[PDB]
Amino acid sequence: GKGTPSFGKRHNKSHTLCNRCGRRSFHVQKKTCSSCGYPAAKTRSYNWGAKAKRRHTTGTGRMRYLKHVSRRFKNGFQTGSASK
Amino acid sequence: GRVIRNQRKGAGSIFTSHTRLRQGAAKLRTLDYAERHGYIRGIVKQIVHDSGRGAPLAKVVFRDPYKYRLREEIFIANEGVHTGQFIYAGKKASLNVGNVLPLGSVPEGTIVSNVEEKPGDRGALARASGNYVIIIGHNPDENKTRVRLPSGAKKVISSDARGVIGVIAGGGRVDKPLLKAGRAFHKYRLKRNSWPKTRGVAMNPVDHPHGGGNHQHIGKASTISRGAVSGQKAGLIAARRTGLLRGSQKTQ
Amino acid sequence: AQKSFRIKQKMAKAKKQNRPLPQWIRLRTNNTIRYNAKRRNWRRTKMNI
Amino acid sequence: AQRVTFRRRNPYNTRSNKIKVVKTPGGILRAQHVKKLATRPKCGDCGSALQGISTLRPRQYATVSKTHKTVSRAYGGSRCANCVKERIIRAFLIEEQKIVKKVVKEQTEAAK
RNA sequence: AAACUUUCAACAACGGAUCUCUUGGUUCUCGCAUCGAUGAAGAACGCAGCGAAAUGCGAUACGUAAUGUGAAUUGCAGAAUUCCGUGAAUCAUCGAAUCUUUGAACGCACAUUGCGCCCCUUGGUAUUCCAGGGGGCAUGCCUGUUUGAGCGUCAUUU
RNA sequence: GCGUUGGAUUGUUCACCCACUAAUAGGGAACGUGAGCUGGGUUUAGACCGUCGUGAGACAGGUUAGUUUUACCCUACUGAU
RNA sequence: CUCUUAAGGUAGCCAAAUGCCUCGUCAUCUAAUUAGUGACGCGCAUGAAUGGAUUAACGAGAUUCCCACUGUCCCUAUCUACUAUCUAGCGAAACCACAGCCAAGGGAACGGGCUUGGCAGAAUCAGCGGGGAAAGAAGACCCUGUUGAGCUUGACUCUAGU
RNA sequence: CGUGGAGGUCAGUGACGAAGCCUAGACCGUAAGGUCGGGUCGAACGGCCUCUAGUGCAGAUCUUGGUGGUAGUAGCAAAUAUUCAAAUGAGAACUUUGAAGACUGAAGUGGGGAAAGGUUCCACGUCAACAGCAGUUGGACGUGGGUUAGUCGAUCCUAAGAGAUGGGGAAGCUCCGUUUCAAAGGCCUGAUGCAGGCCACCAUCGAAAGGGAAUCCGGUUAAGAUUCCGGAACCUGGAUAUGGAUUCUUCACGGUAACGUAACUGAAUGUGGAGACGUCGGCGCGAGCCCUGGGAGGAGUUAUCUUUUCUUCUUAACAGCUUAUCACCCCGGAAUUGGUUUAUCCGGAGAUGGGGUCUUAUGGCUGGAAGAGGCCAGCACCUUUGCUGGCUCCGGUGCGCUUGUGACGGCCCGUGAAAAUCCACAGGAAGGAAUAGUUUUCAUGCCAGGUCGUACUGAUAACCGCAGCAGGUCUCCAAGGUGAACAGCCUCUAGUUGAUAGAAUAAUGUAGAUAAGGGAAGUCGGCAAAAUAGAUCCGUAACUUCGGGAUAAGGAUUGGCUCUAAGGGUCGGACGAUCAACUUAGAACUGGUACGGACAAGGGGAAUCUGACUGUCUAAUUAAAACAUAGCAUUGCGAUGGUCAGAAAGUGAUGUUGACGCAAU
RNA sequence: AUGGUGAACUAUGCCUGAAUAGGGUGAAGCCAGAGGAAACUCUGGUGGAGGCUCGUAGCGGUUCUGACGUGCAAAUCGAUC
RNA sequence: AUAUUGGCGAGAGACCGAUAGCGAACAAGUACAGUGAUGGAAAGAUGAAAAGAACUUUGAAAAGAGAGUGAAAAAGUACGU
Ligand SMILES: CN[C@@H]1[C@@H](O)[C@@H](O[C@@H]2[C@@H](O)[C@H](O[C@H]3O[C@H]([C@@H](C)O)[C@@H](O)[C@H](O)[C@H]3N)[C@@H](N)C[C@H]2N)OC[C@]1(C)O
Ligand SMILES: CN[C@@H]1[C@@H](O)[C@@H](O[C@@H]2[C@@H](O)[C@H](O[C@H]3O[C@H]([C@@H](C)O)[C@@H](O)[C@H](O)[C@H]3N)[C@@H](N)C[C@H]2N)OC[C@]1(C)O
Ligand SMILES: CN[C@@H]1[C@@H](O)[C@@H](O[C@@H]2[C@@H](O)[C@H](O[C@H]3O[C@H]([C@@H](C)O)[C@@H](O)[C@H](O)[C@H]3N)[C@@H](N)C[C@H]2N)OC[C@]1(C)O
Ligand SMILES: [Mg+2]
Ligand SMILES: [Mg+2]
Ligand SMILES: [Mg+2]
Ligand SMILES: [Mg+2]
Ligand SMILES: [Mg+2]
Ligand SMILES: [Mg+2]
Ligand SMILES: [Mg+2]
Ligand SMILES: [Mg+2]
Ligand SMILES: [Mg+2]
Ligand SMILES: [Mg+2]
Ligand SMILES: [Mg+2]
Ligand SMILES: [Mg+2]
Ligand SMILES: [Mg+2]
Ligand SMILES: [Mg+2]
Ligand SMILES: [Mg+2]
Ligand SMILES: [Mg+2]
Ligand SMILES: [Mg+2]
Ligand SMILES: [Mg+2]
Ligand SMILES: [Mg+2]
Ligand SMILES: [Mg+2]
Ligand SMILES: [Mg+2]
Ligand SMILES: [Mg+2]
Ligand SMILES: [Mg+2]
Ligand SMILES: [Mg+2]
Ligand SMILES: [Mg+2]
Ligand SMILES: [Mg+2]
Ligand SMILES: [Mg+2]
Ligand SMILES: [Mg+2]
Ligand SMILES: [Mg+2]
Ligand SMILES: [Mg+2]
Ligand SMILES: [Mg+2]
Ligand SMILES: [Mg+2]
Ligand SMILES: [Mg+2]
Ligand SMILES: [Mg+2]
Ligand SMILES: [Mg+2]
Ligand SMILES: [Mg+2]
Ligand SMILES: [Mg+2]
Ligand SMILES: [Mg+2]
Ligand SMILES: [Mg+2]
Ligand SMILES: [Mg+2]
Ligand SMILES: [Mg+2]
Ligand SMILES: [Mg+2]
Ligand SMILES: [Mg+2]
Ligand SMILES: [Mg+2]
Ligand SMILES: [Mg+2]
Ligand SMILES: [Mg+2]
Ligand SMILES: [Mg+2]
Ligand SMILES: [Mg+2]
Ligand SMILES: [Mg+2]
Ligand SMILES: [Mg+2]
Ligand SMILES: [Mg+2]
Ligand SMILES: [Mg+2]
Ligand SMILES: [Mg+2]
Ligand SMILES: [Mg+2]
Ligand SMILES: [Mg+2]
Ligand SMILES: [Mg+2]
Ligand SMILES: [Mg+2]
Ligand SMILES: [Mg+2]
Ligand SMILES: [Mg+2]
Ligand SMILES: [Mg+2]
Ligand SMILES: [Mg+2]
Ligand SMILES: [Mg+2]
Ligand SMILES: [Mg+2]
Ligand SMILES: [Mg+2]
Ligand SMILES: [Mg+2]
Ligand SMILES: [Mg+2]
Ligand SMILES: [Mg+2]
Ligand SMILES: [Mg+2]
Ligand SMILES: [Mg+2]
Ligand SMILES: [Mg+2]
Ligand SMILES: [Mg+2]
Ligand SMILES: [Mg+2]
Ligand SMILES: [Mg+2]
Ligand SMILES: [Mg+2]
Ligand SMILES: [Mg+2]
Ligand SMILES: [Mg+2]
Ligand SMILES: [Mg+2]
Ligand SMILES: [Mg+2]
Ligand SMILES: [Mg+2]
Ligand SMILES: [Mg+2]
Ligand SMILES: [Mg+2]
Ligand SMILES: [Mg+2]
Ligand SMILES: [Mg+2]
Ligand SMILES: [Mg+2]
Ligand SMILES: [Mg+2]
Ligand SMILES: [Mg+2]
Ligand SMILES: [Mg+2]
Ligand SMILES: [Mg+2]
Ligand SMILES: [Mg+2]
Ligand SMILES: [Mg+2]
Ligand SMILES: [Mg+2]
Ligand SMILES: [Mg+2]
Ligand SMILES: [Mg+2]
Ligand SMILES: [Mg+2]
Ligand SMILES: [Mg+2]
Ligand SMILES: [Mg+2]
Ligand SMILES: [Mg+2]
Ligand SMILES: [Mg+2]
Ligand SMILES: [Mg+2]
Ligand SMILES: [Mg+2]
Ligand SMILES: [Mg+2]
Ligand SMILES: [Mg+2]
Ligand SMILES: [Mg+2]
Ligand SMILES: [Mg+2]
Ligand SMILES: [Mg+2]
Ligand SMILES: [Mg+2]
Ligand SMILES: [Mg+2]
Ligand SMILES: [Mg+2]
Ligand SMILES: [Mg+2]
Ligand SMILES: [Mg+2]
Ligand SMILES: [Mg+2]
Ligand SMILES: [Mg+2]
Ligand SMILES: [Mg+2]
Ligand SMILES: [Mg+2]
Ligand SMILES: [Mg+2]
Ligand SMILES: [Mg+2]
Ligand SMILES: [Mg+2]
Ligand SMILES: [Mg+2]
Ligand SMILES: [Mg+2]
Ligand SMILES: [Mg+2]
Ligand SMILES: [Mg+2]
Ligand SMILES: [Mg+2]
Ligand SMILES: [Mg+2]
Ligand SMILES: [Mg+2]
Ligand SMILES: [Mg+2]
Ligand SMILES: [Mg+2]
Ligand SMILES: [Mg+2]
Ligand SMILES: [Mg+2]
Ligand SMILES: [Mg+2]
Ligand SMILES: [Mg+2]
Ligand SMILES: [Mg+2]
Ligand SMILES: [Mg+2]
Ligand SMILES: [Mg+2]
Ligand SMILES: [Mg+2]
Ligand SMILES: [Mg+2]
Ligand SMILES: [Mg+2]
Ligand SMILES: [Mg+2]
Ligand SMILES: [Mg+2]
Ligand SMILES: [Mg+2]
Ligand SMILES: [Mg+2]
Ligand SMILES: [Mg+2]
Ligand SMILES: [Mg+2]
Ligand SMILES: [Mg+2]
Ligand SMILES: [Zn+2]
Ligand SMILES: [Zn+2]
Helices within B2-45 (DSSP H only): 5-8, 33-36
Measured CA A34 to C1' I56 distance, in angstroms: 49
CB contact under 8 A, C6 and A17: yes
Q: List all chains that touch chain A, counting a touch as 3 or more CB pairs closer than 8 Å.
A: C
Of the CA atoms within 13 Å of residue B37, those in its CB half-sphere come to 3
Between CA B242 and CA B213 the distance in angstroms is 24
Closest Cα partner for D38 from D27, D49, D24, D25? D49
Task: Give chain A as a DSSP string.
Answer: -TTGGGTTT--S-SEE--TTT--S-EETTTTEETTT-TTSSSPP--STTHHHHHHHSTTSS--TTGGGHHHHHHTTS--S----
Per CA to C1' distance, which residue is closest to H143? C19
Q: What is the resolution of this structure in A?
A: 3.7
Q: Residue A16's closest chain C neighbor by CA?
A: C49
Please tell me whether residue D31 adopts helix, strand or coil conformation. strand
Q: Tell me whether residue A14 is annotated as binding.
A: no
Of the CA atoms within 13 Å of residue B58, those in its CB half-sphere come to 30
Give how far the C-alpha of residue D28 lies from the chain's centroid of Cα atoms, to the nearest Å.
39
Please tell me whether residue B45 adopts helix, strand or coil conformation. strand
Instruction: Name the structure determination technique.
Output: X-ray
**Residue D21 backbone dihedrals phi, psi, to 5 degrees:** -80, 120
Between CA D105 and CA B157 the distance in angstroms is 39
Measured CA C39 to C1' F30 distance, in angstroms: 64
Which nucleotide in the DNA or RNA is closest to residue B18, CA to C1'?
Answer: I14
Q: Could you say which DSSP state residue B214 is in?
A: T
**Residue B75 backbone dihedrals phi, psi, to 5 degrees:** -115, 145
Between CA A51 and CA B126 the distance in angstroms is 65
* Cα B230–Cα B236–Cα B238 angle in degrees, nearest 5: 75
Burial class (CB in 10 A: 0-12, 13-18, 19+), B147: buried
Burial class (CB in 10 A: 0-12, 13-18, 19+), A58: exposed
Q: Is B213 left (phi over 0), alpha (psi -120 to 50) or beta?
A: left
Residues of A with CB under 8 A from a CB of C: 13, 16-17, 24
Identify whether the C-beta of residue B77 lies closer than 8 Å to the C-beta of residue B56.
Answer: yes
Identify whether the C-beta of residue B78 lies closer than 8 Å to the C-beta of residue B65.
Answer: no
- Ligand 111 centroid to residue C1 C-alpha, Å: 8
Contact residues for strand G with beta carbon within 7 Å = B 1-2, 205-206, 209, 212, 216-217, 220, 227, 229-230
Which residues in chain B belong to E strands, given as ranges? 40-48, 57-63, 70-76, 86-89, 100-102, 111-113, 133-139, 144-148, 154-158, 162-165, 223-224, 236-237
- Ligand 120 centroid to residue C9 C-alpha, Å: 82
Helices within chain B (DSSP H only): 5-8, 33-36, 181-189
Which amino acid is present at B201? Answer: V
Closest Cα partner for B148 from B161, B129, B134? B134
Q: Which residues contact B109 (CB under 8 A, 6 or more apart)?
A: B134, B135, B136
Between CA B76 and CA B165 the distance in angstroms is 11
Which nucleotide in the DNA or RNA is closest to residue A69, CA to C1'?
Answer: E34
Q: Is D52 left (phi over 0), alpha (psi -120 to 50) or beta?
A: left
Q: What Å distances lie between residue D45 and B74, D21, D56, CA to CA?
A: 20, 40, 21
Bond preceding residue B196 cis, omega within 30 of 0:
yes
As a residue count, chain D comes to 112
Between CA D67 and CA D53 the distance in angstroms is 8
Bond preceding residue B140 cis, omega within 30 of 0:
no
Q: Which residues contact A31 (CB under 8 A, 6 or more apart)?
A: A39
Residues in chain A within 8 Å Cβ distance of C48: 24
Which nucleotide in the DNA or RNA is closest to residue D55, CA to C1'?
Answer: H359
Q: Could you say which DSSP state residue D93 is in?
A: H
Q: Could you say which DSSP state residue B55 is in?
A: S
Q: How far is C37 from chain A (nearest CA, A)?
A: 21
Q: What Å distances lie between residue B236 and B160, B210, B232, B233, B243, CA to CA?
A: 38, 12, 11, 8, 11
As a residue count, chain B comes to 252
Closest Cα partner for B40 from B4, B82, B70, B20? B70
Dihedral Cα B43, B48, B51, B52, nearest 10 deg: 60
Write the residue in C6, C10, C49 that is nearest to A13 by C-beta.
C49
* Cα D85–Cα D90–Cα D91 angle in degrees, nearest 5: 95
Closest Cα partner for D7 from D18, D46, B232, D15? D18
* Cα B80–Cα B85–Cα B86 angle in degrees, nearest 5: 125
Burial class (CB in 10 A: 0-12, 13-18, 19+), D30: middle
Q: What Å distances lie between residue B170 and B52, B101, B105, B130, CA to CA?
A: 13, 23, 27, 6
Identify whether the C-beta of residue A23 lies closer than 8 Å to the C-beta of residue A16.
Answer: no
* Cα B45–Cα B47–Cα B52 angle in degrees, nearest 5: 145
Which residues in D1-112 belong to E strands, given as ranges? 19-23, 29-33
Please tell me whether residue B138 adopts helix, strand or coil conformation. strand
CB contact under 8 A, A24 and C48: yes
Which amino acid is present at B198? Answer: T
Which nucleotide in the DNA or RNA is closest to residue B217, CA to C1'?
Answer: G50
Closest Cα partner for B168 from B36, B54, B45? B54
Q: Tell me whether residue A5 is annotated as binding.
A: no
Identify whether the C-beta of residue B62 lies closer than 8 Å to the C-beta of residue B71.
Answer: yes
Identify whether the C-beta of residue B76 lies closer than 8 Å to the C-beta of residue B55.
Answer: yes
Between CA B176 and CA B166 the distance in angstroms is 23
Between CA A55 and CA B86 the distance in angstroms is 76
Residues in chain C within 8 Å Cβ distance of A13: 49
Q: How far is A75 from chain C (nearest CA, A)?
A: 35
Residues in chain C within 8 Å Cβ distance of A25: none
Give how far the C-alpha of residue B1 lies from the chain's centroid of Cα atoms, to the nearest Å.
36
Which amino acid is present at B186? Answer: H
Q: What number of other Cβ atoms are within 10 A of residue A37's Cβ?
A: 17
Closest Cα partner for C49 from C2, C6, C1? C6
**Residue B157 backbone dihedrals phi, psi, to 5 degrees:** -135, 150
Residues in chain A within 8 Å Cβ distance of C49: 13, 16-17, 24
Between CA B146 and CA B159 the distance in angstroms is 9
Between CA A9 and CA A20 the distance in angstroms is 30
Q: How far is C47 from chain A (nearest CA, A)?
A: 11
Between CA D32 and CA D22 the distance in angstroms is 7
Between CA C25 and CA C33 the distance in angstroms is 7
Three-class SS string for B154-191? EEEEECCCEEEECCECCCCHHHCCCCCHHHHHHHHHCC
Between CA B33 and CA B40 the distance in angstroms is 10
Q: How far is C49 from chain A (nearest CA, A)?
A: 8
Which amino acid is present at B135? Answer: I
Q: Which residues contact D104 (CB under 8 A, 6 or more apart)?
A: none
